[PDB]
Write a protein that binds this ligand. Structure first.
Ligand code: HEM
Length: 152
């Protein structure tokens, strides 16, 4: 549950992402894959990437980063009223991709890391607080659907 002022912070931060969605999305995925190499194994189309240089050179990885961040941005812009947008993603991630909730925690922290790396000194404590709460809400609503499905 976020206040109006917290949502305002989230959507202000998101403007930084929307200025370069592909660059942010690329770096988010690289932070996830290099920090948590088991996550790469869930992607049949990226498992061939052995080095970070290959990850950086991959145009398809940047494309997928755009897909991921476009979806998250659509959810965040709903300011919590995201049941219709979140349901298909919870269902596909539990039943087809088999993504444990832990990996959604990993990517949430990766987003925070990338924002500080690309905007050092321009991602303040209030903005970090609000972004963190928004990603927690996203993860928590996914977790509820995972429990419904019995997925671990
Ligand atoms: C911010 C969180 C994330 C968002 C919004 C997101 C969004 C999406 C979207 C929109 C798709 C394509 C449509 C679909 O299959 O439902 C997708 C595909 C996928 N997601 Fe996620 N995702 C997230 C996190 C993750 C994480 C943490 C993993 C694994 C560690 C992952 C693994 C996958 C895989 C395996 C695919 C299929 C890729 C393919 O072969 O084309 N996702 N995701």
């Amino acid at each position: 549950g976020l206040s109006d002022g917290e949502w305002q912070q989230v959507l202000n931060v998101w403007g930084k992402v929307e200025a370069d969605i592909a660059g942010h999305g690329q770096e988010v995925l690289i932070r996830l894959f290099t920090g948590h190499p088991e996550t790469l194994e869930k992607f049949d189309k990226f498992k061939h990437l052995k080095t970070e240089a290959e990850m950086k050179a991959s145009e398809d990885l940047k494309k997928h980063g755009t897909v991921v961040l476009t979806a998250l941005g659509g959810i965040l812009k709903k300011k919590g009223h995201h049941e219709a947008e979140l349901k298909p993603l919870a269902q596909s991630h539990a039943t087809k991709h088999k993504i444990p909730i832990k990996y959604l925690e990993f990517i949430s922290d990766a987003i925070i890391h990338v924002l500080h790396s690309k905007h050092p000194g321009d991602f303040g404590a209030d903005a970090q607080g609000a972004m963190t709460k928004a990603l927690e809400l996203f993860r928590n609503d996914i977790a509820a659907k995972y429990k419904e499905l019995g997925f671990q």
